[PDB]
Amino acid sequence: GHMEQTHRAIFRFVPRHEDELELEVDDPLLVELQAEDYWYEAYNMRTGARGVFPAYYAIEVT
Amino acid sequence: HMEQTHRAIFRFVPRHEDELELEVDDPLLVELQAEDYWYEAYNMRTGARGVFPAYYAIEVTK
Protein backbone atom coordinates (compact mmCIF):
# COMPACT_ATOMS: atom_id res chain seq x y z
CA GLY A 1 0.00 0.00 0.00
CA HIS A 2 1.07 3.64 -0.50
CA MET A 3 2.09 4.95 2.93
CA GLU A 4 2.64 8.76 2.90
CA GLN A 5 5.09 9.67 5.69
CA THR A 6 3.59 12.52 7.77
CA HIS A 7 6.25 12.89 10.51
CA ARG A 8 9.83 12.13 11.50
CA ALA A 9 10.95 11.15 15.02
CA ILE A 10 13.44 13.65 16.55
CA PHE A 11 14.10 11.89 19.91
CA ARG A 12 14.60 8.25 20.95
CA PHE A 13 11.49 6.86 22.71
CA VAL A 14 11.79 3.54 24.56
CA PRO A 15 8.34 2.34 25.63
CA ARG A 16 7.51 1.75 29.31
CA HIS A 17 3.85 0.95 28.47
CA GLU A 18 2.22 -1.76 26.32
CA ASP A 19 0.38 0.73 24.01
CA GLU A 20 3.52 2.74 23.08
CA LEU A 21 5.39 2.86 19.77
CA GLU A 22 9.20 2.67 19.96
CA LEU A 23 11.02 5.47 18.13
CA GLU A 24 14.54 5.99 16.96
CA VAL A 25 15.65 9.44 15.77
CA ASP A 26 14.79 9.97 12.05
CA ASP A 27 12.19 7.15 12.04
CA PRO A 28 9.62 7.92 9.33
CA LEU A 29 6.10 7.90 10.81
CA LEU A 30 2.61 7.75 9.41
CA VAL A 31 0.62 9.52 12.13
CA GLU A 32 -2.97 8.15 12.05
CA LEU A 33 -4.34 10.34 14.88
CA GLN A 34 -3.10 13.49 16.68
CA ALA A 35 -5.12 13.02 19.91
CA GLU A 36 -6.27 15.99 22.06
CA ASP A 37 -4.05 14.75 24.98
CA TYR A 38 -0.87 15.33 22.82
CA TRP A 39 -0.25 11.64 22.14
CA TYR A 40 0.07 10.54 18.51
CA GLU A 41 -1.14 7.16 17.30
CA ALA A 42 1.10 6.11 14.43
CA TYR A 43 2.62 3.49 12.19
CA ASN A 44 6.45 3.39 12.37
CA MET A 45 7.45 2.97 8.70
CA ARG A 46 10.90 1.62 9.74
CA THR A 47 9.74 -1.02 12.29
CA GLY A 48 6.23 -1.77 10.91
CA ALA A 49 4.86 -1.36 14.49
CA ARG A 50 1.81 0.63 15.59
CA GLY A 51 1.26 2.45 18.86
CA VAL A 52 1.22 5.77 20.66
CA PHE A 53 3.98 8.23 21.50
CA PRO A 54 4.31 11.76 22.95
CA ALA A 55 3.38 14.27 20.21
CA TYR A 56 6.53 16.44 20.47
CA TYR A 57 8.81 13.45 19.73
CA ALA A 58 7.88 13.84 16.04
CA ILE A 59 7.79 16.78 13.61
CA GLU A 60 5.88 17.11 10.31
CA VAL A 61 7.76 16.31 7.07
CA THR A 62 6.41 19.64 5.58
CA HIS B 1 19.22 21.35 48.09
CA MET B 2 15.65 20.46 47.13
CA GLU B 3 16.50 22.76 44.13
CA GLN B 4 15.22 22.79 40.52
CA THR B 5 17.20 20.59 38.08
CA HIS B 6 15.00 20.86 34.94
CA ARG B 7 12.19 22.84 33.23
CA ALA B 8 9.45 21.26 31.07
CA ILE B 9 9.41 22.49 27.44
CA PHE B 10 6.35 20.57 26.12
CA ARG B 11 2.87 19.77 27.41
CA PHE B 12 2.59 16.16 28.62
CA VAL B 13 -0.86 14.77 29.52
CA PRO B 14 -0.48 11.34 31.11
CA ARG B 15 -2.11 8.25 29.62
CA HIS B 16 -0.41 6.00 32.23
CA GLU B 17 -0.62 5.99 36.04
CA ASP B 18 3.18 6.26 36.64
CA GLU B 19 3.43 9.48 34.54
CA LEU B 20 3.90 13.08 35.70
CA GLU B 21 1.74 15.74 34.02
CA LEU B 22 3.76 18.63 32.58
CA GLU B 23 2.82 22.08 31.49
CA VAL B 24 5.38 24.15 29.58
CA ASP B 25 7.73 25.95 32.06
CA ASP B 26 7.01 23.57 34.97
CA PRO B 27 10.03 23.46 37.29
CA LEU B 28 11.19 19.87 37.97
CA LEU B 29 13.42 18.12 40.51
CA VAL B 30 14.60 15.09 38.53
CA GLU B 31 15.49 12.27 40.98
CA LEU B 32 16.35 9.55 38.41
CA GLN B 33 17.66 9.84 34.85
CA ALA B 34 16.72 6.30 33.74
CA GLU B 35 18.65 4.40 31.01
CA ASP B 36 15.46 4.19 28.85
CA TYR B 37 15.23 8.03 28.40
CA TRP B 38 12.41 8.45 30.98
CA TYR B 39 13.01 10.83 33.90
CA GLU B 40 11.43 10.41 37.36
CA ALA B 41 10.71 13.79 38.90
CA TYR B 42 8.91 15.97 41.38
CA ASN B 43 6.90 18.77 39.70
CA MET B 44 7.70 21.79 41.88
CA ARG B 45 4.55 23.62 40.60
CA THR B 46 1.93 20.85 41.10
CA GLY B 47 3.62 18.86 43.93
CA ALA B 48 3.08 15.63 41.88
CA ARG B 49 5.68 12.90 41.25
CA GLY B 50 6.07 10.58 38.29
CA VAL B 51 7.88 9.77 35.06
CA PHE B 52 7.99 11.63 31.78
CA PRO B 53 9.84 11.32 28.46
CA ALA B 54 13.34 12.78 29.08
CA TYR B 55 13.37 15.18 26.10
CA TYR B 56 10.26 16.98 27.45
CA ALA B 57 12.56 18.74 29.95
CA ILE B 58 15.76 20.76 29.70
CA GLU B 59 18.46 21.11 32.33
CA VAL B 60 18.65 24.45 34.16
CA THR B 61 22.31 25.54 34.41
CA LYS B 62 21.72 26.34 38.12
Residue numbers in the entry:
A (entry chain BBB): 487 to 548
B (entry chain AAA): 488 to 549
Tell me what the authors wrote about this structure, in their words:
The SH3 domain of JIP1 undergoes exchange between two distinct conformations, as evidenced by 15N NMR relaxation measured at multiple temperatures (Supplementary Discussion). The 15N and 1HN relaxation dispersion data were analysed simultaneously according to a two-site exchange model in which a highly populated major state interconverts with a low-populated minor state (Supplementary Discussion). The analysis of the data gives a population of the minor state of pminor = 2.8 ± 0.1% and an exchange rate constant of kEX = 2,600 ± 70 s−1. Aromatic 1H–13C heteronuclear single quantum coherence (HSQC) spectra show averaging of the NMR signals of the tyrosine ε1/ε2 nuclei of Y526, which shows that full 180° ring flipping occurs. During the structural transition between the major and the minor state, a void volume is created around the ring of Y526 that corresponds to a pocket expansion of 65 Å3; this is mainly due to the structural reorganization of the side chain of Q520. Notably, the transition from the eclipsed, major conformation to the staggered, minor conformation is associated with a structural change from a rare, classic β-bulge to a common, canonical β-strand conformation. Breathing motions along the structural trajectory between the major and the minor state generate the necessary void volume for fast ring flipping of Y526 to take place.
